[PDB]
Amino acid sequence: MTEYKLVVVGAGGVGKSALTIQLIQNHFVDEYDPTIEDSYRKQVVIDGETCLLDILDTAGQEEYSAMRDQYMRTGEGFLCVFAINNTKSFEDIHQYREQIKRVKDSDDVPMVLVGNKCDLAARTVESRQAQDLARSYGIPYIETSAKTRQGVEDAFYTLVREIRQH
Template sequence: MTSEYMNTYDASLDDEFGEKSVSVLLDGEESELIFIDHPSTEMSVENCLSTYEPHACLVVYSVVARGSFIRAGELLSYLVREQFTADRTVVLVGNKADLARARQVTTNEGKALATTKESKFIETSSGIQHNVDELLVGILKQIRLKENREKKQAKKVGKQEPKPSKLASSRTHISLSIARELLQKICINDISKSKSCENLHVL
């Protein structure tokens, strides 16, 4: 969690409560990320989520230990079932990416799991500080994007639907509406192709 890049730095360390914090500067605004790291022997994932109500979850596995990858899949399935992924950030993290010769889990397997479990994906190496900064900034970006989306949705709910005009029932208007819907579907499909599970800067 220490870093030399992207204006991040280790702010505090509290081993007693399993909480660590780091300050991250993103788009000119500084935020403090607090990581809650309880071993599953001390506190279950269910209890951790209900106790802390986190904005995001990082599910970390080791690319050199397939067992940890299987466990990560189980945790992601739980988060999907509990609908945590619907409005919260979940990032699947494959750590120890520098240990290429001992690798048991491929990058493509990690991506595939993340995609099927509505999560983002990144591989890191805490040992050589590979992608650690990108992960920290990406978590914050995802949290902000989801919060902004929720605010926009809340505004939409507050607005009343306008009354249909006389034009709305005409054939021309109906044809235009169908054309617009088709165009939107095409555009949405193109956009979704560009939104990779590895891009932590888009939803």
């Protein structure tokens, strides 16, 4: 079947694993459990197409740079995640986007900007500023909560659709 190589990136603790585990395992992980590199393979049906989601859940730790170019080259689509209560994670998005573009030789790679932890009250990043950033990249902006599952399928399925349209 058609396989989609999806890669979730972003700063440490923004919820990359929590989003992925919600998608694949239907629950919220509330624990501290930093990732090195996890792979998830799941057969799904999206818009009537049988497909395999091949998802790589990456490390936010900056001490894992080298591993990054490797996975950025083979991924077809990227979720670039920040947390809406962590401005530094938002500011970091530019560095992940630039790194992906450079290793993929492309300024138009399938990507979604994901503002996670939208269940939380203490927001520090306004949705308008992330939407503006996303428009500047020409990609969709989707807000999510791994906690409540708000937006989770929407983000991953939107990314699959971006890959389909590439």
